[PDB]
């Protein structure tokens, strides 16, 4: 009629905690070697068959905006980028007066193999990289000669993002929501425990999301402070729209020796016809997706007439759509995409034509804002083409008061690229020890 | 592997708390690997210190002869194991855990000394 302490080991009890999650990549290497920026090597654990385990009648609160997994990933991104570009060409003898004439034919005095000699180098530099400093030949300088030195990507390093899995050590677990139309904050209906997150590709883009994971049945708009207009708005896609970005502008890159092992690659004359980079958007599908997004935003915004305006503040990284196709950064405008009014008169306009957007490619890349190292992207020999299937948009709401809300494109920090994909996951630690009273009397 | 049947009743957890149990079999990534492995080793060692120090050692359902004063809990068996889950129970006895551990250790050393001295 009395109870005694009974020690249990292995009880299903978990507590919120933050730990260091390692890497888990689908085993490559038979891709030759090809050391990508997100090193396949040192990602020793090859992901085995996923080990799912559903938790019945378990309701766990989730908060995507206070998750530590995003910071995990972001710090690993910056560290991996620095590690990748560190052990090769330094390229410091570049900040000089550029006696230039898009692009410009610029001439400058460059250090050659020897300390005594000096060579005159003619190179083509894009107008974005060129900075001004009664004639016909002007003199210029680079974009970031006041911030930090310019460093080459690296001779054989590929920029292709591969899926990365994030498991936890023993004694920890990850709770996946698996809830349809999950807003990212609040209770989750049923929850399953997993070791690694699903394969996520660390694509880097601004103002328009890239390759990723789709939704389940509808459009999900998730934002930390939807009322506040200073917080970016993240939109998930019911369905994806494919885009085609190409550079049919065949290059002839030439390498010059600027030091004992310092090989500098510069853009030569464009053989054949000259073309400008562009991206193609399926007009009908894009307009339908934008209309669905506006309809799903209306309920969150008191059924107001949603209007999309192009980017206003002039800032080359912010106002442009940043991405890489095969090692080249495009920076097109999205004005012809994000310019429409929805619900104001309930009727159409739209058309259904393929949308072509002009692009302004540059080579000096000050990505990760000022935290990341400046990079110089060497030119690619042949034509460039990559096929992308858009999953997500990064919107921004505008201080004045009216009956219509203006959402212009442009996100915030680089964390928003992966906030759309780490929302469902949440790291948690488990305590197997447990004490319950029984009638045992022994031991 | 222990996460299964987390929200189930305590009886179902007990019959499941032994159904998986355990199947077993300079780079920043290497640093993360080493940190994770050391942390897992430390947690396992901590749990084993507590188990062996209470006299459990390598037993899953460990018994003890410590009484159950109606100060840590005042509910009766059937409601503990039916009107509750493991997380609810742990929250119920959250801040009595240190006292309970101390009493377990004292009882273990008492019984060990008693058996050693009765061994004559």
């Amino acid at each position, epitope marked *: 009629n009395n109870l005694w302490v009974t020690v249990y080991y292995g009880v299903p009890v978990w507590r919120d905690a933050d730990t260091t999650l390692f890497c888990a990549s689908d085993a490559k290497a038979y891709e030759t070697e090809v050391h990508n920026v997100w090193a396949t090597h040192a990602c020793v654990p090859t992901d085995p068959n996923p080990q799912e385990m559903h938790l019945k009648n378990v309701t766990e609160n989730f*908060n995507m905006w206070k998750n530590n997994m995003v910071e995990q990933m972001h710090e690993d991104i910056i560290s991996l980028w620095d590690q990748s570009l560190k052990p090769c060409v330094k390229l410091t003898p570049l900040c000089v007066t550029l006696n230039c004439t898009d692009v410009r034919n610029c001439s400058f005095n460059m250090t050659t193999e020897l300390r005594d000699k000096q060579q005159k180098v003619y190179a083509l530099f894009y107008k974005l990289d060129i900075v001004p400093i009664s004639s016909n030949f002007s003199e210029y300088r680079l974009i970031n000669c006041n911030t930090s030195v310019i460093k080459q990507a690296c001779p054989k390093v590929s920029f292709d993002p591969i899926p990365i899995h994030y498991c936890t050590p023993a004694g920890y677990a990850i709770l996946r929501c698996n809830d349809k139309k999950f807003n990212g904050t*609040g209770p989750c209906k049923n929850v399953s425990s997993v070791q690694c997150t699903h394969g996520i590709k660390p694509v880097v883009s601004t103002q328009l999301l890239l390759n990723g994971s789709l939704a389940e049945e509808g459009i999900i708009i998730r934002s930390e*402070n939807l*009322t506040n207009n200073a917080k970016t708005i993240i939109v998930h896609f019911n369905e994806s729209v494919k885009i085609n970005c190409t550079r049919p502008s065949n290059n002839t890159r030439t390498g010059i020796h600027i030091g004992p092992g310092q090989v500098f690659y510069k853009t030569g004359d464009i053989i054949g016809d000259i073309r400008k980079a562009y991206c193609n958007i399926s007009g009908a599908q894009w307009h339908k997706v934008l209309g669905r997004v506006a309809n799903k935003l209306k309920e969150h915004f008191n059924n*107001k007439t949603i209007v999309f305006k192009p980017s206003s503040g002039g800032d080359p990284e912010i106002t442009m759509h940043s991405f890489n196709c095969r090692g080249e950064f495009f920076y097109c405008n999205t004005t012809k995409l994000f310019n429409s009014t929805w619900g104001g008169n309930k009727n159409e306009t739209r058309d259904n034509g393929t949308i072509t957007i002009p692009c302004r490619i540059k080579q000096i890349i000050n990505m990760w804002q000022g935290v990341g190292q400046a990079m110089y992207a060497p030119p690619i020999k042949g034509v460039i083409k990559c096929l992308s299937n858009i999953t997500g948009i990064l919107l921004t709401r505008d201080n004045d008061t009216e009956n219509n809300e203006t959402f212009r494109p442009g996100g915030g920090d680089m964390r928003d690229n992966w906030r759309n994909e780490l929302y469902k996951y949440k790291v948690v630690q488990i305590e197997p020890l447990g004490i319950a009273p029984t009638k045992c009397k022994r031991r | 592997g222990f996460l299964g049947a987390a929200g189930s009743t305590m009886g179902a957890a007990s019959i499941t708390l032994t159904v998986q149990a355990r199947q077993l079999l300079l780079t920043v990534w290497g640093i993360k690997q080493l940190q994770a492995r050391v942390l897992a080793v430390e947690r396992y060692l901590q749990d084993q210190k507590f188990l062996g120090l209470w006299g459990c050692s390598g037993k899953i359902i460990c018994c003890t002869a410590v009484p159950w004063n109606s100060s840590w809990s005042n509910k009766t068996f059937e409601e503990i194991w039916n009107n509750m889950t493991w997380i609810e129970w742990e*929250r*119920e006895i959250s*801040n009595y855990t240190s006292q309970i551990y101390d009493i377990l250790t004292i009882s273990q050393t008492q019984q060990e000394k008693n058996e050693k001295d009765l061994l004559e």
Partner: antibody
Amino acid sequence: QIHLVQSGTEVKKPGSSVTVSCKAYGVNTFGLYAVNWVRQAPGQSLEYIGQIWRWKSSASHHFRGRVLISAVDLTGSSPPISSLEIKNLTSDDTAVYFCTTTSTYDRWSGLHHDGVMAFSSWGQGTLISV
Amino acid sequence: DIQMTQSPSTLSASTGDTVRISCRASQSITGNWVAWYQQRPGKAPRLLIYRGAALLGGVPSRFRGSAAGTDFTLTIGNLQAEDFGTFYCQQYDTYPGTFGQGTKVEV
């Protein structure tokens, strides 16, 4: 930070209906948070009416078919709001009404336990009289 | 379902005097699910102590409680100027919660 402001005070008649709206400033969602309605009689101990915890309305034993709880989450301009609706009011209902909100994100914080919970934040109150 | 009362109903103390605020519940609360409230005249109360004897972020260190079975006592060491006012202890382990009549401090 967390600021709870609600409607003003007014006088009504027996048999009417009262709608008291509580605006939650600083509360992200009513999924992570939980709002509780408590009434303090003039110069008397407090009394608990009910709650809407992660979209689950409930009421005390005496408030059956008598009180209704509504809650609206974040919008474009307005903050999350929860409204108190009482009908068939009588002379004993004249008291100050308080809107209370607490965070339920952490299960080990101890502020909440199986729906019944403490009140971390409080509103200014609405005096009601006949 | 828990008939909780607190004594003494009224008491008087000056600045710098330790004040005993206690309330024996009708039933033992082993989970320490008791909350302490301090209501200034006019405006709302605030939560001082939760989970028996746990402080809240932004509370002076002079408010400390105790959990001994059914007895729950609140201590105010070095009583300060704003501390004058009625007090409330509330249980939140069994639905629904219940408060006390009210203990107040007067000069």
